[PDB]
Design a binder for this molecule. Structure first.
Ligand code: UTP
Ligand code: UTP
Ligand code: UTP
Ligand code: UTP
Ligand code: MN
Ligand code: MN
Ligand code: MN
Ligand code: MN
Ligand code: MN
Ligand code: MN
Ligand code: MN
Ligand code: MN
Ligand code: MN
Ligand code: MN
Ligand code: NA
Ligand code: NA
Lengths: 437, 437
């Protein structure tokens, strides 16, 4: 319905509602009140400050600004003190150096202590450059706030907003840098059609060039890749969505797909048509934060995938899910049953001592020579992919992530069939198998 | 029972019997009679001449010796004429240049025409060096005739005597050169324990050295490998048999193993225990000689093996058999059934034009991105190895050898199970699966 009219309608799905904007301003004024009474110098940074936050993601970022001559724990101990006095409730979170996360009048706030540096040139981590992030964007982004919200809404409706590990998508700072570089949502989307996995966007030089990896150069620190947490596959999904949108634009690109919600009977039918083995490893969810859990689920699922490939079960795809109580690692394989017998490699015929050792073992069938080398028929200890994973998980839990592995050691189950379709995984199965509406 | 006493007992299994020696001498005298009346110059060569032929392999080789100045077809036309006058019956065989094979008083004779060269130095093929083979061996092998017969009997009882393609073993000329080089059967067997696939035996230089392939240098022609038709796997089998014999010598090494002769019920049991797919391609045997047929059966069986590997049926081993009326190509696979669905590779995400073409095809399930590249779920046209070979044999017969392929084009069958155990292939199946006594 013409690109320009679709973008006007999308603004209603992307701009926060009335009670959100008011809820936020009440919390900000109260927060100013408490900090001012303590005599601390501070600055509100982030998407709240710059009026670029997406509908439904209200969150207030504050940095406490201190004299340049204070030690490492003079900023840690003192900075925390103020953060605990100013919030209704709090939690010691850990991004790189510890900060405070809490609530003020029912609104999430982060309080981060750092130096008051005149000019940046002083490297440490991402914490100490964040004030300079705000300083660089403030007033380069003025007038373009809705362009930022269009880009964030687009990305969110398609599951790729956020740099946290559950997502591996686009951060808020990244969205704002893109809008500054290209000028608008529409120009971002038109130009991203030509991005590659080697594209380097150098915001401070107004330059695009080729490199070894996808790299967005932080204008505050030339060694920092702002797109570091963006996965290759999510970059690919975004380039394809940009091409599709420009080919046939729709308001539907700004709305989240309502899920498949299939009945166990239709899934049973689909699994019968495909002729595959479909199963899950179930275990208790360890008590750790998402940014620690999700890298472990990814690793555990890859190590089991690699086992299935090496054992000739021909895995197609894998997925994983965490609920409140349990985690699930999901697999589909092309092979449901393999023969008991397999071929084990022995030595070359010339090597007399090692040939004697190879032929000494008792076996049911006779070894043989093929292309100058000895081989023997031997028996597998499992013949289905479910039996294989039971064995792998019981013995090699120590490679499946520190905490995920320790949980599997205590308890796991392999589930298939009518039992599997009753766990909260039908949505992940459907996506993994490419099931249509 | 002591190596030396075993070798004395083996001489009875290796030396021709009474009526064989007499049957041969009658045919030789008659043959001399007929050639002498024609005024042709000739010489008896080969294992008959030198009294080195194994029990049960009586055959007389004659070469007709002609003046040096006769053209290529002056030796072909004239040489044939004499060969047809001298034999009771005949056949035009083809080794390299045509010769005559027939019978005299119930004994096989070959008559080959070639030049009467003073000194060898005149290269053409293996035909024109054969008189010089005899000349070089005559009287180097005197006194060692039973040593040669021990070596041939050893090799025969173990299925590796003969350079013809059905066997790919040791020729008679090769056995005689080995006995000259090492001095005896026992010294041959002790030294062959250390042969490798790089061993070069240079009989004329009294030297063993290393090369690129196993090579026995003809003392008449330094460019000719006398062991050219010996397979790598039969060289390996011979080195291992030599090691075993010296470790625990037995008369049993000179006797042929009496076969397994299993009942269909025991084979059914074994196939059930292994859990594999076992099947054969059956077709009519083309009307051609063995040295043409066996290379074609080997090729056809390899091309089908390579198909099964490429289609993920995990073939273990293959074999082949020709009876009087039919041929059989035999296979055992680890996978009895594979899923209908498989993963087809598409283009990298960057390549917009080729991505559009890939996503245009109608399919039952949705394509997906993985590690920067597009993939699609598609459906196989067969799910068992038997169904796969039916398809391969029907469409790609043109790669299965000229004559074997043309027969399969006219008629073939895939046979498994209780039907398979009733064809004359149980012995080849047992060997292929390493079945024990
Ligand atoms: O791990 C890190 C490191 C550094 N920072 C830095 O802290 C600042 C605030 O981090 P946010 O991710 O909250 O940025 P935001 O407010 O712009 O976006 P949304 O909440 O709307 O998603 C950003 O400017 C970033 O540079 C992180 O956010 N996370
Ligand atoms: O490339 C490979 C990898 C692994 N393997 C075999 O599979 C097993 C598991 O290999 P994994 O890599 O899945 O588990 P792990 O890290 O716990 O390995 P280990 O420390 O226990 O060795 C190993 O014990 C190895 O022998 C291979 O044979 N080849
Ligand atoms: O293809 C060829 C080429 C050449 N020759 C040459 O012709 C001669 C006779 O060929 P034979 O193989 O009949 O030799 P043989 O008589 O020594 O052994 P057996 O029959 O007892 O097995 C051999 O000396 C060889 O060099 C072939 O036999 N075949
Ligand atoms: O390495 C290979 C070989 C073969 N193939 C595929 O399998 C088929 C049969 O490959 P074959 O090599 O078994 O038969 P052929 O000689 O008759 O091959 P064509 O002349 O018909 O091509 C071919 O059509 C080829 O596409 C591969 O995909 N990869
Ligand atoms: Mn924020
Ligand atoms: Mn924040
Ligand atoms: Mn927070
Ligand atoms: Mn930075
Ligand atoms: Mn392990
Ligand atoms: Mn002969
Ligand atoms: Mn002959
Ligand atoms: Mn003959
Ligand atoms: Mn020669
Ligand atoms: Mn073909
Ligand atoms: Na195990
Ligand atoms: Na076909």
């Amino acid at each position: 319905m013409k690109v320009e009219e679709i973008l006007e309608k999308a603004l209603e799905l992307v701009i926060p509602d009335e009670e959100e904007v008011r809820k936020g301003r009440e919390a900000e004024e109260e927060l100013r009140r408490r900090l001012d009474e303590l005599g601390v110098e501070y600055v509100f940074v982030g998407s709240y400050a710059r009026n670029t936050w997406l509908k439904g993601s209200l969150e207030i970022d504050v940095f406490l600004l201190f004299p340049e001559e204070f030690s490492k724990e003079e900023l840690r101990e003192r900075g925390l003190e103020i953060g605990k006095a100013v919030l209704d409730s709090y939690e010691i979170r850990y991004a790189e150096h510890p900060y405070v996360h809490g609530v003020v009048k029912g609104v999430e706030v982060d309080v981060v202590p750092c130096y008051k540096l005149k000019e940046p040139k002083n490297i440490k981590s991402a914490v100490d450059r964040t004030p300079f992030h705000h300083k660089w964007l403030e007033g380069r982004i003025k007038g373009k706030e809705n362009e930022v919200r269009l880009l964030k809404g687009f990305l969110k409706a398609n599951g790729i907003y956020g740099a946290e590990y559950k997502v591996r998508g686009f951060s808020g700072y990244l969205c704002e840098l893109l809008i500054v570089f290209y000028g608008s949502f529409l120009e971002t989307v038109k130009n991203a059609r030509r991005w590659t996995r080697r594209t380097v966007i150098d915001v401070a030089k107004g330059e695009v060039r080729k490199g070894e990896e996808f790299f967005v150069v932080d204008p505050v620190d030339e060694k920092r890749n702002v797109a570091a947490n963006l996965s290759l596959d999510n970059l690919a999904r975004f380039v394809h969505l940009c091409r599709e949108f420009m080919e046939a634009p729709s308001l539907g690109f700004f709305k989240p797909k309502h899920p498949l919600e299939i009945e166990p009977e239709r899934l049973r039918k689909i699994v019968e048509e495909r002729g595959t083995a479909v199963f899950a490893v179930k275990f208790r969810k360890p008590d750790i934060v998402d940014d620690n859990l999700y890298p472990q689920l990814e690793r555990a699922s890859r190590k089991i995938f690699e086992f299935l490939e090496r054992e000739n079960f021909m895995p197609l795809r894998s997925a994983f899910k965490a609920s409140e109580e349990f985690c699930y690692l999901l697999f589909e394989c092309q092979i449901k049953e393999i023969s008991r017998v397999f071929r084990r490699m022995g030595p070359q015929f010339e090597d007399e001592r090692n040939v004697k050792k190879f032929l000494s073992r008792n076996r049911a069938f006779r070894p043989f020579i093929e292309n100058g080398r000895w081989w023997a028929f031997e028996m597998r200890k499992f013949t289905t992919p479910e039996e294989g994973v039971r064995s792998y998980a019981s013995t090699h839990w120590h490679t499946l992530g520190k905490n995920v592995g320790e949980s599997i050691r205590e308890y796991f189950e392999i589930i298939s069939g009518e039992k599997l379709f009753k766990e909260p995984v039908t949505a992940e199965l459907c996506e993994m198998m490419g099931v249509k509406d």
